[PDB]
Design a protein around this ligand. Sequence first.
Ligand SMILES: [Mg+2]
Ligand SMILES: [Mg+2]
Ligand SMILES: [Mg+2]
Ligand SMILES: [Mg+2]
Ligand SMILES: [Mg+2]
Ligand SMILES: [Mg+2]
Ligand SMILES: [Mg+2]
Ligand SMILES: [Mg+2]
Ligand SMILES: [Mg+2]
Ligand SMILES: [Mg+2]
Ligand SMILES: [Mg+2]
Ligand SMILES: [Mg+2]
Ligand SMILES: [Mg+2]
Ligand SMILES: [Mg+2]
Ligand SMILES: [Mg+2]
Ligand SMILES: [Zn+2]
Lengths: 86, 169, 292, 117, 112
Amino acid sequence: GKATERADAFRKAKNRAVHYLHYIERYEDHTIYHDISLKFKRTHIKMKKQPRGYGLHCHRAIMTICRLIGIKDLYAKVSGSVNMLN
Amino acid sequence: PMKGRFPIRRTLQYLGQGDVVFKDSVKVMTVNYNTHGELGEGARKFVFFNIPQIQYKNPWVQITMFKNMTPSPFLRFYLDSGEQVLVDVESKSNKEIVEHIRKILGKNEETLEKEEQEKKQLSHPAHFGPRKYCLRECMCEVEGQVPCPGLVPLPKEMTGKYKAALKAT
Amino acid sequence: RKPTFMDEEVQNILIKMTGLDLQKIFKPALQELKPPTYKLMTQAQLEEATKQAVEAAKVRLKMPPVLEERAPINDVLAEDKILEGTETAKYVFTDISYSIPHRERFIVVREPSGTLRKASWEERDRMIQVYFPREGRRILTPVIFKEENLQTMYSQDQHVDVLNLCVAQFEPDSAEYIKIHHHTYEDIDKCGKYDLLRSTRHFGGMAWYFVNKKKIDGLLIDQIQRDLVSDATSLVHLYHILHPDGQSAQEAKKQGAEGLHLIKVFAKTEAQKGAYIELTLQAYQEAFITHS
Amino acid sequence: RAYRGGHLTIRLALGGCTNRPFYRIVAAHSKCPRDGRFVEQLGSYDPLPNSHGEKLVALNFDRIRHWIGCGAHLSKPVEKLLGLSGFYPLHPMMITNAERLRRKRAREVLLASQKTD
Amino acid sequence: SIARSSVHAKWVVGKVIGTAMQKTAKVRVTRLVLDPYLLKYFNKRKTYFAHDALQQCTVGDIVLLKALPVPRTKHVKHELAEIIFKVGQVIDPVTGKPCAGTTYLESPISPE
RNA sequence: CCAGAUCUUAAAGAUCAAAAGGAGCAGGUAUCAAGCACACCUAUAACGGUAGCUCAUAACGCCUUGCUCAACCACACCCCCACGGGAAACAGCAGUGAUAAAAAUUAAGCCAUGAACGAAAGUUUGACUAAGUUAUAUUAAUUAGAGUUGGUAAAUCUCG
Ligand SMILES: [Mg+2]
Ligand SMILES: [Mg+2]
Ligand SMILES: [Mg+2]
Ligand SMILES: [Mg+2]
Ligand SMILES: [Mg+2]
Ligand SMILES: [Mg+2]
Ligand SMILES: [Mg+2]
Ligand SMILES: [Mg+2]
Ligand SMILES: [Mg+2]
Ligand SMILES: [Mg+2]
Ligand SMILES: [Mg+2]
Ligand SMILES: [Mg+2]
Ligand SMILES: [Mg+2]
Ligand SMILES: [Mg+2]
Ligand SMILES: [Mg+2]
Ligand SMILES: [Zn+2]
């Protein structure tokens, strides 16, 4: 969300976010189901599915997002461009 | 490893898990195969998949390939005695070739386990030394014994300083 | 020909009474985890994998030996009076050779008194541990086997774990191994906790103990309230084997007793509590016959 | 490394840390350093009495007599150890030192009852 | 019974590189070596001089070498044992028949 | 793969293994691309004869360098070597000049291990043992000082 005032953009991006929601399927409600590797534009994310105790070892943004999803155990290495939106 | 057609065959694991171990009579194994024909197929997959496994476990055995010399695929084995084993591989599968070779000159699982048993009696549990070769270094680290003074400083009496300062006076 | 714990009869009876519970046998363990593996199977391949798992769980179930207590070792190999005051401590000499069986190693002791004797049992085991360490053994005997700690562990119902510590730490023919296994059995009997050892490899232990001590009460009662009567009857059968001549075993020969009636026989002649046994047999019989 | 001469020997390597000695009984060439390279480790000896008042000695008897059988030589203290174990007769010097010790105890006994007077 | 050579090479098989010296074949031997980084196998080559008594060797022949018990020179440690494939005249070891490449020169099913 | 030395014993063994070798692995540099006799036969050990051999899968050079560590390799004032010649030797322990950003005792014992010699009691050993010195590092407590406060990156107020 984007605005002249910081406060304003905060509001805008919140209220807009709630409109695009995904459902993320969680295996046993902690990990993902299986290993994932994706090249999105110039960013490569590579994630691996962990056992119960191995908490959230990830780029800090991914940890943030995971904590929001409910994914508690994960390993992800991002390579190529680390640009945040991508 | 990304590049290549079947990348899994460049992995240490894949190379390890192949099982053939020649007898010590075997010096040279020579493969002769063709680049074409349906019949030749099996031999080709053998060179593509197992030859790497084989070689890895028999690092001292010269393996040598020849392409399109004879109309038919075969192996030849050169032994130390001068004896020459000739194995016709024709319509045989990749797997069948590996099994048949393992049968002729392999080593029985008995043999291999005896050998590795002789290698595991090499490092004895009760010795002392460098971490590389032994379970323990000082005896400072066995439970009931006297501890490394670098951990638990000695009672003044066992110190040589105290003994010397006693004999002096 | 007095029946022994390794007799195929008694082995088969106890293997049977143990039971295979694949969920308790293979249970999540507290070790470091690695991510799970997945394969796609037919109904066929799944049945095969299950059967392999079962055969594996047989090996996991193999009973730790039971032995009677070993005899104290006292043997002097020599006396040298001359060495008498020369040392304040004792020298302990351990043959360590990789080939030798640990019951055949020579463990010798020079005392200050000068006599050269064979090592005692406890010294011997402690020593073998020092030079041939195997995980799970402390050289100094661990605190946990004092009565206090043991009681604490019984109250958290860890009895399986106790038995396993014990199998690791001591020697099956030792004094402590036997002391602790019997004290433990005694506690699962006082509390009626038998099912704790059910699919354990330790079941036949308290079986063979309770047979020879002649308390089958608790274990019969338990076995029947769990609605396993094939096992209760296997148990009285076992009692008869290990007491061929006794009024119950003999009366079972006279009356030609079928299994349930066998349990009735035993209930009448021998067992210390016949009231609870007959009552539970009643309830089981009647309730089961009316339900099915 | 290549030496001129010298024989195979069974001695004590001294491992340990200051004031806390420990020994590795060892078959080594004679001319090589005390704590250095060896042919085969044979046993260990811990001089300091432990929790139970024992000095622990370990001897690989099979290998020991294999090497003695190749004509290795023993050190005086290894001799003393084997003898103590009963794998060799007592070393004469053990016996003698024992006797000397006895006579010292005797003369200190007499000197004690002489000074008490 | 002592006749030995201290060489690791007791039997090798290789191509004949050149015949230029009297009674001596130059022979390129090739082994598979595992490049450690790529875990792959490549062909390392090495040459051997071999003693040829009758000067039997054309260039290109595949040939078998046996290690000589006593080295003939500093560079000659092998004697040529057999000629495994004569160059461009090859008799199939399987069917015992003359062949040029992948073709049979005389068919094995036409005995008479 | 072992000649030799040494130990033991008649021999056989065994320990250390020179010389000679080679499946494989082995610093940088290709603006070092050719080396220049670096091969083989004959046979008697020579006469003689073929014209080869190494190398872009790095020969031949140049630079840098102990090491893959129960250890190994090398050196022992210099001239790779040591007959000779410079010349008069701590790269044994301590010390000292010089030099460097770089700073341990001109110390005590053979009591233990090791080594040498002795038939032996034993003697010798700056190996070594026990000490001395040093915030270099750990640990234990008796010890409080240093750095920082725009962002990265924990943390600031008033003056100049
Ligand atoms: Mg030290
Ligand atoms: Mg020799
Ligand atoms: Mg050598
Ligand atoms: Mg240098
Ligand atoms: Mg020099
Ligand atoms: Mg100098
Ligand atoms: Mg010199
Ligand atoms: Mg100096
Ligand atoms: Mg000098
Ligand atoms: Mg100075
Ligand atoms: Mg310094
Ligand atoms: Mg100063
Ligand atoms: Mg000394
Ligand atoms: Mg001495
Ligand atoms: Mg001195
Ligand atoms: Zn220590």
